[PDB]
Design a protein around this ligand. Structure first.
Ligand SMILES: Oc1c(Cl)cc(-c2cc(Cl)c(O)c(Cl)c2)cc1Cl
Ligand SMILES: Oc1c(Cl)cc(-c2cc(Cl)c(O)c(Cl)c2)cc1Cl
Lengths: 114, 114, 116, 116
């Protein structure tokens, strides 16, 4: 039900080997670790969760952009890129969170489908 | 070697049934029709060309954004979105041209891979 | 030293009356309130801080996008847009944090200048 | 009535000395030169036209991104960024055309206001 895709706007490529951490907001408003991984050669991270586990709630996707740029020897602005959203059962069932990265900027969108 | 992908930033979805026209710059600097189609349910348009036909040169991808918004009953700013680039044999062989559409804005990127 | 600018990609306009909260990471690693305000009719928020107060640190600028969209009758995807960055670590700079908002997407950039 | 603003997403700065050419579609469907200039140190290009000259029509703003990147040692993807729009069809408006540039990507938006 959840896929994260990261692209590099400097090289025109997938952003490969980017660390991604997913958190779920707890009852006490803290962020509890949920799923994590590193993007593949396609810039994608699949297999984070299952339909059973991915219940309604507020989730945060944290993308380690700073390490990505530093590994390319490029000085970046942001510490990370964070995407925070509510999962809703009334909407479509599959969520792609995409991010398009530059050193001093990023774009992010959601593609939510059945 | 060429795929076009169009996304809708208002609905969080693929942009389906969007007309896309591809042109190649001729020797006299005019744009000659090359390929065209309409995006699929996934927002993608595959099958535009073949490796044999997609020689080095300057290409233009024109995305009919205005008709897309008008069909949703939404007033848009742009007449269309145009992406103009050089195909280069020294670079990677596969080109994805992606566009993320809003009524008064768009983002576009290239994902160029082997 | 710090300005925030927010634009609306649906209407082609400034995003007016957007709430913005700025935090600074404390020595104990918590986010401390630093400053807040709302965008003006130009989509800009000035006057958040001073060059004396805006010391080195890790700052978070939280833009309350959800409240903004809901008031237009759009049920948006994101809770907020957060921008996290180290500031002033090579001496004072001027920072503009800009965001371009859609219901299911946003772009953000920084314009960083050196006052001399 | 028409301002163009260009930002650099790699450096976090205005995109300075970017060439911009504006065209207007003629009655014979050709693109007629309308006005041109280069972005200033703020990344802005003012003074392209007047409210009298900027009549109804279909306009193209061509931003010469390739030349800009090449001068930074980046071989970019696009030839240029072109923005095509109908202007002033409900009376005069003020238009800001903004672009945020990366070597393989750009974003563009419009801010359209009504002077009253
Ligand atoms: O498959 C995708 C490709 Cl190729 C591109 C984008 C994508 C994502 C963002 Cl944030 C953008 O600004 C643009 Cl222009 C494309 C998204 C997906 Cl899901
Ligand atoms: O003054 C500005 C104007 Cl008009 C536009 C942007 C701006 C900001 C983002 Cl995030 C964009 O994707 C685009 Cl295309 C423009 C920024 C500033 Cl500071």
């Amino acid at each position: 039900p959840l896929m994260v895709k990261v692209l590099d706007a400097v090289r025109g490529s997938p952003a490969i080997n980017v660390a991604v951490h997913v958190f779920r907001k707890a009852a006490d408003d803290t962020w509890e670790p949920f799923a994590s991984g590193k993007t593949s050669e396609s810039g994608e991270l699949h297999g984070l969760t299952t339909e059973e586990e991915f219940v309604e709630g507020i989730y945060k996707v944290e993308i380690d952009t700073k390490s990505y740029w530093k590994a390319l020897g490029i000085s970046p602005f942001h510490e990370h890129a964070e995407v925070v959203f509510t999962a809703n059962d009334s909407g479509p069932r599959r969520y792609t969170i995409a991010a398009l990265l530059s050193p001093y900027s990023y774009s992010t969108t959601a593609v939510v489908t059945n």
